Ligand SMILES: *C(=O)[C@@H](NC(=O)/C(=N\OC(C)(C)C(=O)O)c1csc(N)n1)[C@@H]1NC(C(=O)O)=C(C[n+]2ccccc2)CS1
Ligand SMILES: [Cl-]
Ligand SMILES: [Cl-]
């Protein structure tokens with residue numbers, strides 16, 4: 001069912017890095033990874049938690065639609081793009097943490113936890129600050145656990161409205177051309193060791209969907225582009241994209 | 243409300259071509275075009291019709307959703323990408339006429355004519371102008387058409403054409419050669435962080451080798467107006 005392809009490691013070593021890529025061929029229900037053990041190692045979800053946090057917020061009406069504006073609170077923050085108004089689309093594109101902490105507080109522990117148990121999401125543990133548990137709280141999720149969650153999202157199978165799932169898959173739009181469509185969220189876990197980078201989503205082809213989840217050691221923010229670059233080297237190595 | 247910017251004509255004649263491009267800045271609610279007369283001329287919609295058709299099919303049930311598989315009837319047509327199975331996403335992409343022909347049969351004239359008239363589409367008794375395309379497209383963007391929100395969302399999904407960290411383009415191509423003038427279309431919009439530019443262009447397409455120019459000339463104009471890099 002799974003299959004180890006350690007060749008992929010050359011892409012991590014080329015860039016002097018370490019991590020795991022996990023691929024899943026929907027048509028052939030076959031997974032692939034350079035490291036089956038690390039594929040199942042659970043880390044903080046960091047901003048990949050913005051997928052489930054969007055779904056819940058939309059489904060509870062915290063977010064009415066992807067046009068609703070969330071005004072900047074006027075607190076200038078190290079991340080220049082955080083210091084403006086945002087709707088769901090730009091908030092996900094630019095991982096606007098404070099916008100989603102506010103979603104989190106309006107959701108509340110109770111519903112947050114109930115929903116993560118409905119979603120089957122990683123270790124389902126929200127314990128910590130309701131508005132930071134995904135950065136420095138209890139929640140743990142592995143790459144293969146990201147793929148099970150995303151596959152459900154992709155078939156409108158989560159226990160929230162079809163519309164909610166449709167609007168979140170829209171906000172995940174990352175890349176589209178005439179060979180593929182990538183829908184995906186980045187993560188950068190940096191408050192608790194180990195420092196890692198996430199990239200989770202999937203690539204849509206004419207006649208298949210390839211779901212991916214990768215994470216990798218991220219000591220300094222200089223390697224943040226490697227998250228996507230190494231994934232695509234794998235996808236390009238496996239002929240999923242040209 | 244409509245400014246003529248004849249400067250754009252150079253993007254047409256550098257490619258030894260004649261046409262119109264129509265832009266609509268949505269924030270400011272102002273449009274701009276290289277040719278005001280040609281922007282209100284109605285040409286054959288050709289495949290740009292696949293948009294209202296997709297909506298009606300969806301909102302009626304001919305199409306359950308964008309995953310449903312429309313199997314090839316085994317008849318080999320000259321466009322190779324038609325000679326296979328397709329879903330809404332790939333039938334819009336490849337402009338698979340015989341798939342859409344079938345949608346329309348199952349929709350049937352009566353229902354089709356009633357809805358086309360509810361969208362106030364092309365003619366009220368198909369030809370439509372570049373500026374009528376924009377106006378239809380703006381309602382689609384805001385989910386203001388008289389079909390379900392779901393209908394409208396799935397069609398915008400199926401209109402996805404290009405996306406990066408500078409813009410998203412949702413659009414549909416069109417090409418007709420039965421009748422003069424032979425015209426290509428490209429209609430849709432480009433989404434920015436805090437604005438959305440609708441576009442509609444058409445151009446004399448006297449052969450076919452210049453089909454890429456529908457997209458190329460449109461981007462040269464978006465590039466000029468600083469809307470995209
Ligand atoms: C879209 O507009 C479709 N156009 C047609 O199918 C053509 N004619 O339709 C008639 C009946 C004439 C009409 O008025 O609608 C047609 C295609 S080629 C030719 N000599 N007549 C599809 N047009 C698109 C497109 O937007 O360009 C096609 C994409 N394509 C083009 C060239 C080669 C392969 C694929 C296919 S048809
Ligand atoms: Cl979050
Ligand atoms: Cl909803």
Ligand SMILES: [Cl-]
Nearest residue numbers: 170173399402
């Ligand atoms: Cl989309």
Ligand SMILES: [Cl-]
Nearest residue numbers: 308310329330
């Ligand atoms: Cl379909």
